[model samples]
Target: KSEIAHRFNDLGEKHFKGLVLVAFSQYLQQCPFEDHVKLVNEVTEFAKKCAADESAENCDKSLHTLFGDKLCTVATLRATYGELADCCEKQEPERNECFLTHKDDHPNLPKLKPEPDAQCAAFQEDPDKFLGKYLYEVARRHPYFYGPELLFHAEEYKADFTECCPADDKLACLIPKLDALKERILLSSAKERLKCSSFQNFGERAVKAWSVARLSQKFPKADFAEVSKIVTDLTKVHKECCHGDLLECADDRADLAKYICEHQDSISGKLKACCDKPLLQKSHCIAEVKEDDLPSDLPALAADFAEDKEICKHYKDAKDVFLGTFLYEYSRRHPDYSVSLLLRIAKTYEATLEKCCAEADPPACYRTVFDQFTPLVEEPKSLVKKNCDLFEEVGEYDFQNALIVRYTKKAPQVSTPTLVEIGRTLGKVGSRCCKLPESERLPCSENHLALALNRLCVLHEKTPVSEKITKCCTDSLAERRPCFSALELDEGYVPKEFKAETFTFHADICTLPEDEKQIKKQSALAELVKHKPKATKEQLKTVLGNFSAFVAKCCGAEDKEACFAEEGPKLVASSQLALA
Candidate 1:
């Protein structure tokens, strides 16, 4: 009663509490529906005690339920949190450390007699030795089983094997019964695997950070450096073992298992639950720990990949490892994104190299590569979703108007005409893409946007716009618009807000062809975009609507030149003043 109470008490403590919520939730979701009911009831029964009993004296008795039942009995314990089946225990706990660490601290463990194969000969090798060896194999591999549980299973196996080996004919009875042990361990391993996925989902550093948080918070006065050192080694084993590394997975696992076991009192009391099980299971990584929590190894090159630098040169030597590690790190960090999205991330990263490496300034191209990932990471969001939403909200002209006004102000050192051109291409890109089916929009936008920026980057490099834009243009593809979206004007290049010159209309508009008059209208509208940057597209539309009517009225009049010369300045003044 007390043990169960204390266990809950330990669990509810902050450090374990955080991890338990995560790990247990994972196991609960992953395990059989029945296991969920049972695990919860067990914790609830114990938790009920600690909640009421300030002394925590009798949590075991606090459970109002009766004794062993179907799932609650000895058999289930053989595979589950089977520790309580034993008395408050002992082991070569030290050796179990190697058991957890997977280091061979003990003598090399022997394998089971390959079932049904030369069993009599192996059995005759020595009953004592054979019995000891098989159980060790069973115990080591089936770390989910508790020590006493294994000992209980062992004694049963000992009796069954001892009698059978010497029985009427050695091979007669051994086949089915002998294989049962492997089946049981295999069954236990299967159960353990339910929790394995969450460990795989959360990757190394996040889990490690959780441990650091737990230990640092739990033992404020302890030697955290030493603690960090231990957890680091322990985290490595968890990663390797979880990945199915046979060599270190076992022995490398045992040592850390032993460390947590030996220090459970000083460290976390929740350690007792995991530690009481076999070493390898004890050392199994943390699970569904809801990290409510870098590639810091990046050099200065991460920040400033200049045009003159050679980034792709270094990126080329071990290209596979480079890309592999990036995807690996990226996948781990973004545990929630779809594999399709991650594959997209990798694709875009490769595309960055495909184009950036060939650019005159590979380093400058590389500089914004990181910036692009944020967009890719959020691929389905803003760059497409927001753009599409805005494009849909306003018709093409206003959309183009909005882009021109912003970019003109954004990079004023670049010619307004160039920005206007760039702005139109962006609007056209959005128009062509945003009209696509929702399913196609994001990817379509990413590809077309990259192409747009590629041409923009390819623009006159010696042009001073080249100075700021080449960095963004070289970004090539993927997000990640940071390069282009985040591009800055040359140092100290802030243009005065605006100089709204009075508009002019010439009688030449009446003499020119009607298509020529339309060109004049477009020029007036385009000028309005720059001249009155703050005006709403709706307001600009209203202003341009009037100018169109005036042009139509005068050009169609009997004395067109007189009407235009007389009314043109006032009409121009009226439109510009309204926009102003």
Candidate 2:
């Protein structure tokens, strides 16, 4: 009574007063074992101070009504009766029956409701949905018995749920269903429940099933039964070593699939050797085969011949030479190769090697056969020059002509010494880099043309139209016309701003006949000054008239863009034109 009163006092008057009244009623039912009158008086006094009414009289009346003679005698009988005392200790059926019969004897005792057939019906209707709600209810009612059981069920079925459920809806649906199943199983016999919820016993089977499903998806043509058997066998070995850890087995499946798919030729051979053994020995055999047969020492030549064991055996002695030759031929054939196309090239080379060279020492052996059966291969530089000349003779003159035109057009305003320097760089690039074998030269020329055109355009600051012309000339005639026709420039419309720098930049590289190029430059400048009238002072006109002589005297030829950059500003300043 003193302890209860002290607890209630700590709880205080307002919120805990109702709880205090309930505790007083319960105490009254247990009264007389201790002193009933004394306990009742203590509770009444405590409630007087704590209750909402703050009246000892009201608390006394409430206690008498709650723990009147009839209720208190019933509680005393319930506590003393042998059958009622043993209710919680009985089996479900007997305990529930005992509780049902005696529930009215003690008003505070919980009412016993019979387990419903509706629960089984709900589970049958939608096992997933029914199990979820049912398990939660069971866990809520019997957490000590069913909570850990529920967690075990969730762990056991997690992989199965992951395998079966739509990946997008796993969190929403699968986990809940497993949780429900866990709780439902706790109503089973203790031995059965223990077996059902133990993850250690279930992990290997679950991982094996998961591996089968994953491998089936990756290797559709694979013998799924065989794969499943192998995975199950492997998982048993894994379980023994890992103490039933499924995560390691799950991680191992990817490596298994990679080996199976990547080494398809050796897979059947390896699988046969392993699967032929007894189940206990099979896993060890498979592990040994996986380690030994899966080739890890893949050099460039071996990689090139990966799919062609026949060819690989032939060139096993001459790896370096075969690899170099293979690269040379592959690059020659595929000048503008994409990634997928490069893969195709590798596949094609493997196929060709398999067909062409079946004997050992393939490089030495195939050399005689190749020379006799096929045309001799020429050096890259000689082949490129021959092809370029061949194309030039057949009216394929645009590329070479454009190169010369661009250089001469931008050379005059540049000093003679700088022009010589520019000429030497161009000669080196053309003779050395551009002149590859016919197969190598086609792509090499494309790259060289783009490089040379870009370099000259930067030096000259050529008009957008000329830039387009240079770009188009690098391609074949069919590609060139469409490229040039796509340009947005208007030949007749001159810019409003007087670009004196552009004039001198072009003048340095201009290849047009002296009078022709000069006349064109003069007309373009006059039109530009006419468009922006304030730029056309008498001093500007005088500077413009001798711009060629001014450029030739001041500009160096070694670095054309730099020479133009330095001289261009000074020429603009001399013309008394503000730098635009």
Candidate 3:
């Protein structure tokens, strides 16, 4: 047993040799020819004894079938049939002749002995071609890099190379190939990065670069990520470091527009700061911005849009922070009317309030509002008028408080009820305050006029028609004539058509016909002008002259019917007297 174990150990140790010997023995046991079986049994029986008593615990067991004549005869028949089946199922390669011709020395033969793959050599010889080949090889190694269908292509030799060589050797070639591939990737990536960074010099190139770095880190090789990150970082650094050279690498305006639209918030802060500076005023960095003709303080202005929630939700994190900061700076510079600007800023981010307020620091939010309003109320005042109803709906107390902060340049002596009434009248739908009937119109009474003006100023302060709205309306108006004017001024008071020739005073003031007529005496006329300015001598002359001229024309016209062209003279006169 000891001797057998040693011999078995030797056979077991030579796994390939033992496998072949075992297979041969099994074939013999299944042989059908009695003569062949008897001969195979003798040899297998001895081999089994040696294998069993040696290190192998499992003994070979084909001796019985090999020696049994009847079983051997059946086994031989089966073996012959199996060989025929294999012959029918398997195909012999057309190139098998070459293998047979060099069978003995195939291992030592040169790879080029057979016609070289011309395309493969071409891929290696040229730099651009090699880049293609290198990329293909890299992609093949990591299926994630490319599609599976590529494997069937004739040029797919990367797999073959890896298969022919040992794992360590394959890795050796792979690492260097990957390094070279990375260089080419970066070369192209650099161009794209330069193109984008140049046009967006005022934007957040660093954050974008970092995002690309994070993307690279998920790749197969750890070093590739590091390398990619470094390249991207350097590109961003170079952009910021050498801002002056950006014009050289500027991208197309369309590309910049797309980038701006996508990364509006991130780039908005930088854009705001850069644009404020006079030196870079001519920079193409804002060329795409011009297409929209959005105000220089667009970001801050956008922050005030009623759709602030949507904008805030759509653009969070880096974008919100940057834009928020910009608005804050702008607010700080203009303190007097800053509150009004702040209100606009609040409206701009109304949609985003929950997110911006919760996520953003209060100081940042305050600043954004301040900055956005500075330019709006800087030189010329921005007045916002609302329908008195909408203004009144917002309580007088709240309205005054809101306006007090915004109208810092002015005092809070303005009465709230007065403002509310004025707002209702000014904001009255479909008709002007002066044109609407007493019942329909909110009283533009003196007590309320102050309130109305304050409300209009407050609404304007809180919600400046966003710069975006201005741009959109301006652009749309340019394309289509007679667009609706953005600010809801009292169009009813404005005549549909102005007549310069007609010398008349009755048409100037709109009045209800039921009112008592003023006495021809000037004192009686002055007293009747309640809540309105009394007529001055110039105005009285203008009115008297107009009435006298109307009388003269009535008598002078050869056609008496002309004095009442549209209606009979008695009916026209009665209507006129009632209004007077």
Candidate 4:
């Protein structure tokens, strides 16, 4: 209750009591906080004070400014003021009605006014002038939420409030400093002359200077209006410089020799100068000095390429020389070049070569040759195959050393099992070959085949080898056709066959029961149901036709639409679906 009275005391201090009421209204929008009751009481007291102070000039202004009309009807004012009294007295039913009844009488606050002309003039004299001293004093004496409101939506307000004197303490102060810049710039003699000059001369010198300095500082790039006006003026100057002497110089008897020396030089010089520096030099290489570096002055090259087709043909010889040098160097190092080095060269020369030829097709030959040769040189398959065979021989020699009993006592036990172990190893190799794809099952070498056959014949003498070994030999001979086809081995050679029955199986999961047909059918049904929702509109339309026909026959409907009308309500009610 004391806090509520204090808030009302603060409200009474401000001249515009309606503002306090409006502030309370805004607070109510985010209400139900700890101090809401105190805020409501303060707002009600302020509203009552506003109703009572009708005779005061500032109070009248607040009434007219906020409510948008004179408070002539005492009944309406009493009703509004009475609601405020009810809220402060803790009348709940009346307080709720107060919000409803006063909704229509709620203030329509005025738009903030523009600064007065006199205020601007005062600041223009001296920015140190306090043009808004009265407003600043009023703000300092009141409670305001300017800081959090500004900070919370910083992006929205920062630029706007900078110009608006947002703290209200420096109104018209910032404007004068800006006006000083404008005034000084306006008074400059160069700007006046530049503005007054003929468009062509202005564009050639004055506008160009302004563009590179003043206007560029103002905007990232000058807009099309600035560019187009300058370009139009330049085009007129070009026409006058080129065709100015055409009529008079054609009069051959009237000083033709002198005119040829003077006027012809002028016209030709203008045309050649109009040609871009890079292209003009590239076109007439003998005439232009060779600087041993790319030309720095490239005139509107992107636009020139887009607008003029014949300009590319003008530099054909120069382009050929530039491109030929690069291509020749690339081709010389083509076989030995690494992919990384070639890619680096491609990046470096890509832009220059594109500019040289003006089309990307010719450089593609270099790229294709580089791509084709790089991998072969860096990762040769023939070398990999030779090393693979050497590795296999080393593995075999290590196995032979492991069998010798000179180093360890276990070597004697290992020697007893060596023949059976060799037979088991050969069986695993045969199984691996059989499991591989037919194209890869071809024998790698004749030496591997001969070694396997000699090992297996010794094993057959000691162990019970199957007659399937003979059939396996014939199959191995057949598989050797690919080796001959690949030119890796001779045809008609039968490799060794291993005994398939000699190896023992350890796992029992391979003998599990098979339910192949039932599993496949269920899998197909699951897949169909999973993807049914994502069917195309056309597919859905086909499905809908089939479903409608079924519904018509089963439900005894006259037509599909009738069936839908009958079933739609029931389906919607069951699913809790809305029309929307």
Candidate 5:
């Protein structure tokens, strides 16, 4: 027990306490609310005890009570940290450095995550784990340095835990360390790592000459300061990694995330969210961010996207950089769009390029690429206004019912249940956004409802496009919704004759619930509308009003059963007449 406590004393109580919440976050989230609260209270009390009382016996006992059970197992620790999971086995200050060093890898372009997902789950259950994992992942990439020149660069984080972690205040203690992590452990370069005789043979200033030449060519437009920064970073990585095992040499992504996330002010508001994500996720999410929609004032690339045969050459040779630089160029211009959106832009272009390349008329195939791609980006935003406008026109219950019935015809290959699922997605977006202030509503619906639409688009893409749905499936975004909105079931699909559902008016419904009573009336209207797929919106609207009044009168009547039996069909008949 003193093994941990002795390390704890050497590391100081503050550094030991900092990692507790982070390591236990995921496990704690699934716990019962009371236990989760109790554990935190124990931490707070324990934290205070060490900050003031500083007694050995009480400290070890309190620590045992907190982590003694199956609360945090070795398996959980490994999953949380990836590597450095067994920092517990290391000695005092070294162990403290291990905990302080790692940070989580940030994830890229979100799945346009729904409410039920673990995304909202983090927010809804508790938000404490968010920063904890972020801190953990950042440490994963930042392996420290060695040697005379390298050792100087590593000092900040090495000495920081002692100064930072031993503080009485929580955020204040490790807060400067985060600053130290950025400066001391910033992204080390790839070639600079795998420390070997090459670096030693050249000496420091000698290696600097070739280092400048390599990076300077790749990012030719970079300013002198930026170029100088890269040179220093790479030097750090190569020197340290060379001496370590080949595994450390292989361990070089140097995801420029640590540096990019530091300069929060320079990035767009759209990217700021991504910049805040864990480091690995943060890197790609930022990379995936869309460019501003400015006029193409820049010079054309040397490799032409227009030529078919040659396009394949650039594509085949450095396929990764080819497709990406194409996307990165575009993404940087559209600051208004999400990381997910720019990825859509990226993939969509890639698919188009593939299609164009396959065809005999490759240049012809991609000639209209700009026109074709515009709708995918713009349509989602405009769709929000159109959807939200109608949502306010019709309330949630009616709006969703309309969506369910309308989507059933548009997506006939899917089952009624699937159509209901689509409707629910729409309903959630509409209901969530429609009531918000005008400024807030558009962006809210655009972001979330676009996810739903994108999902729907993919499902439809999989479905074979029949003559009936051709315009509905392939029209411009503005025309796309209209074509579907106008789409109807085949005449043969409609019932040949009207059949009124027999629902005898009973006092039980009145006593049941007001909401249920409204649902019963709406369902009656639905049966009539389904039979008359030819019905206009106004005709259905009038029929709904008439049915509602007729049902109300029957519920109030002395002979309610006869009142409905006699009058319900008469109103339904009038609806059928108007529908024709």
Candidate 6:
């Protein structure tokens, strides 16, 4: 018996050797020595036969058949010989009943649930199909499960399989390879999961840049750095309100817009501080400070058509057409208005235009349309009337020439003939800018006229001399004619190629004479002194120095007076105490 235990131990089957020693020693003490010799020879033969089997499965079957009647003896040896015997015995069905029945006596034994048969026989033929479906479903159901821990589990399983299974067995190699493939799948899924979280976390920052860029497009004069900081500060309030979730943030959009406009003084104060720095450092400091910073559920503006089912159904498509025209100009000018308010305003205009001007003459019809919508706007009634009058008179060549003449009177340096030349150029552009579909023409005409007026102010300052301006300033209004008309029809009306050089003519114009620049600087200084009477001449000089720096930064030669008047006081106030 001892020799058999030594032989099994030599074969490195420790558990088997231990079982053999316990069974024989117990049986020999109960029976005669001669019986023990007979039992030993039988057990040795059984061991030799089992070992001859080439694989563990065949060996297990052989051992089970040989010991079928004596299974109780094998069970007894397992339960009696080991320190963990009680728990080990519970693993065998015959002993498990007693182990469960006497649970109080062996409380340390671990109760275990049976392993689930997740691996299907069909998967043997198509492992990828099984693994792909299984993992994909698991991940879809529980995103958190598709992470690093799963990746580690898959990797470890692959390593263990590779070490334990023979390379010659195709199934063994394939099973381990499947585990490696599962590890890769889990890793890739984990990366995708992490990417989604990262986007969710940082999505609002990208959105901030996008919103500020859009605002920059709308207000070209707005300092880009100041605008960025304004938006960053505004969005910080949004972040605090929404806690980084976009859906939660949607409810706050209107509040945010209101807050931004209401807090204009705060934004202006920060901008004043930034502008107070030395000219070059001012822009840099503003840029640096600015750097420190969702599908709205609102239905498409087109959905407002459904409000009056009768009119909406009648002009189902036409409502979008009308909305396209009305809101294009309205929202550009009134970006703070809620979409709900805009939709309501648009519906009112669309219903009026359809009723009053549906079949009337195009220009006259739109004139009536604007007369109706004019009162709806919040601007001074007089200003709205003027704009409406400008809209009504848009296409008439004489009316356009008269408008240009009125604008030139403001800048009296250009003579009547030169003004006529400029007017003729602008009239041609104005005619096109006002041109629109008959139903859409009036509002379209009004917006372009306003834009023309806005643009002409800058254009006039840039071109004090008629000779210095290029022909593009005159003739290319013909090219931009179609572009201006498209603004009413197209929601996005950025011209792909307009006459840029024509607008930039001031660059070619002479710089402001040194005498004029000096006079403007002295005027700005005098105004500052008037605002601060107690200021010392030296203190005034510091403020003037700051103004001089600002002029070089933004004023340039074109309108030093305008730049000084706009920026000088703010710069002085910001520096007043510091300089004094």
Quote each prediction's TM-score. Answer: 0.34, 0.18, 0.16, 0.14, 0.41, 0.18
Q: Among these predicted structures, which one has the highest TM-score?
A: 5
Ten residues in sequence with the least summed lDDT for candidate 5: 245-254
Worst lDDT run of 10 residues, candidate 3, spans 98-107
Ranking by TM-score: 5, 1, 6, 2, 3, 4
Higher-scoring candidate on TM-score, 1 or 3: 1
Write model 2 residue lDDT over 1-580, tens digit each, in one string: 2332333444443213222222222222223322333433454465555444433333433332322322333444455544455554555445434543442211233222223244334445665444343333332232122222233343344344545353454445544654455534432223222222222333443344333433332222334344555556545534422321112232243344444445554334445565555332443344334212213332343333444445456556775345434533333233332212232233345445555566555554433332331221223334446546644453322232222223333323333223333333344345544455444453344333333333333233322334444555444322332243254332343335545544545434444655444444444344334333334233334555556655554443656567667776676555544412
Question: Across residues 415-491, which tens digit of lDDT does each residue of candidate 1 receive?
Answer: 55456666666777688778877755754565455444443443434354544564553332233355666743233
Off by over 4 Å in 1: 1-319, 322-376, 465-471, 474-480, 487-502, 507-522, 529-541
Clashes of each: 23, 15, 31, 0, 31, 0
lDDT of 5 by residue, 44-138 (tens): 55555555555655565433333433243434556644544565566545553454343222222222212223433453355444333333333
Q: What lDDT would candidate 4 get against the real structure?
A: 0.30
Record all residue pairs in model 6 with backbone atoms less than 3 Å apart, i.e. clashing: none
Q: Which candidate leads the pack in lDDT?
A: 1
Residue 46 CA displacement from its true place in model 5, Å? 26
The all-Cα superposition gives candidate 3 an RMSD in Å to the true structure of 37.4
Better structure of 2 and 4 per TM-score: 2
lDDT of each: 0.50, 0.38, 0.32, 0.30, 0.48, 0.38
Best of the two (1, 6) by lDDT? 1
Candidate 2 vs candidate 4, lDDT winner:
2
lDDT-wise, the better of 1 and 5 is 1
Q: Please, what are the lDDT tens digits per residue for candidate 6 over residues 1-580?
A: 2332233433334223323322333221222333333444566565665455534333443222232223234434443434324433333444433322221111222222112233434345554343333322333322323222232333344344444343455455555555455545533433333223222333663335333533432332334444555566545534522221121222233334444345444343344455554332343334323211111232343233333334434454565444543444444344333222344455566666566445544334434443454454433333334544565655444443343334342233343333443444445444553354442333334433433332332244344443222232232221222222222212122222222221111221225666445444443443333334344555665655675677675546466566555664566457546433
Residue 173 displacement (Å), model 5? 37
Off by over 4 Å in 4: 5-90, 104-111, 118-580
lDDT of 3: 0.32
